Amino acid sequence: GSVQIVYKPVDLSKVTSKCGSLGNIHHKPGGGQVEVKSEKLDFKDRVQSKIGSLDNITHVPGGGNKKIETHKLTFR
Amino acid sequence: GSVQIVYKPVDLSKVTSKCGSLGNIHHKPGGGQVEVKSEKLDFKDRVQSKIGSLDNITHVPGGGNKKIETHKLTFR
Amino acid sequence: GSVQIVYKPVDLSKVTSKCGSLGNIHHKPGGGQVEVKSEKLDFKDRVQSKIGSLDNITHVPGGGNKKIETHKLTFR
C-alpha cells in the first residue's frame, strides 16, 4: 500500500493600494517634568527601566501592503 | 490499502484599497509632572518600569492591506 | 511500501502600491526635565536603563510592501 501526497496550493491573489497623496504628518511628543528621589536604585535581573525617556517611531510607507504566507508539510 | 492525499487550495483573492489622501495627522503626546519618593527602588527579576516616559508610534501606510495565510498538512 | 511526496506550490500573487506623493513629514520629539537622585545606582545583570534619552526612527519608503513566504517540508 503506497502513500501519495500531492501538495499543490495555487495563489493568484492581489494585495494592492492606490493613494493620491500622504500629507502633512507631525509627530512631536513632549517630555514632562520627572523627579525620582531615593537612597538606592537596585536592579538585579532582566530589568527594563525607562525614566523620563522618549521612544519614537514615524513609519509612513507609500504602500505598506503585506502578503504573509506559510507552507508546512510534515511526513512521519 | 493505499493512501492518496490531494491538497489543492486555489486562491484568486483581491485585498485592495483606493484612497484620495491621508491628511494633516498630528501626534503630539504631552508628559505631566511625575514625582517618585522613596528610600529604595528594588527590582529583582523580569521587571518592566516606566516612570514619566513616553513610547510613541505614528504609523500612516498609504495602503496597509494585509493578506495572512497559513497552510499546514501532516501525515503519520 | 512506496512513498511519493509532490510539493509544487504555485504563486502568481501581486503585492503593489501606487502613491502620488509623500509630503511634509515632521518628526520633532522634545525631551522633558528629568532629575534622578540617590546615594547609589546599582544594576547587576541584563538591565536596560533609559534616563532622559530619546530613541527616534523616521522611516518613509515610497513602497514599503512585503511578501514573506516560508516553505517547509519534513520527512522521517
Added chain:
Amino acid sequence: GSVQIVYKPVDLSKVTSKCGSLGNIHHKPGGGQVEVKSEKLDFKDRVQSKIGSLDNITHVPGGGNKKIETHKLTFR
C-alpha cells in the same frame, strides 16, 4: 545653623498662535465660474474696486505673541 536656598523654577509651557487658514482639506472641489459684462468703466477719485474676482485671500495683522519673565532672588 545654616541657610540653603534652591531656586529651580521649571518652565515647559507653550504659547501658540494659529492664524488664519490652517489645516483645511479640499477633496475634488469643482471649478468656480465668474462672468461679468461691463463695457464702459470710468473711475475718478480715490476709487478702490474688484470686478470678477475668485480670490482665496488670507490677511493676518494679528497672531503676535508676547512672553515676559522676571526671576528675582534677594538675600540680605
Added chain:
Amino acid sequence: GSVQIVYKPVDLSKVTSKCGSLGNIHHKPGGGQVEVKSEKLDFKDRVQSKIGSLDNITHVPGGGNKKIETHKLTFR
C-alpha cells in the same frame, strides 16, 4: 536651627489662540457660478466696491497671546 528654602514651581501650561478658518473638510463641493450684467459704471469719489466676486476671504487682526510671569524670592 537652620533654614532650607526650595523654590521650585513647575509650569506645564498651554496658552493657545486658533483663528479664523481652521480644520474644515470640503468633499466634492460643486463649482459656484456668478454672473453680472452692468454695461456702464461711473465711480466718482471715495468708492470702495466689488462686482461679480467669488472670494473666500479670511481676516485675523486678533488672536494675539500675552503671558507674564513674576518669580520673586526675598530673604532677610
Added chain:
Amino acid sequence: GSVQIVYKPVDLSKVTSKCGSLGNIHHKPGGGQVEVKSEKLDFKDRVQSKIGSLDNITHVPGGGNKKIETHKLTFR
C-alpha cells in the same frame, strides 16, 4: 554656619506663531474660470482696481514673537 544659594531656573518653553496659510490639502481641485468684458476703461486719480483676478493672496503684517527674561540674584 554657612550660606548656600543654588540658582538654576530651567526653561524648555516654546513661543510659536503660525501665519497665514499653512498645512492645507487640495486634492484634485478643478480649474476655476473667470471672464470679463470691459472694452473702454478710464482711471483718473488715486484709483486702484483688479479686473478678472483668481488670486491666492496671503498677507501677514502680524505674527511677531517677543520674549523677555530678567534674571537677578542680589546678595548683601
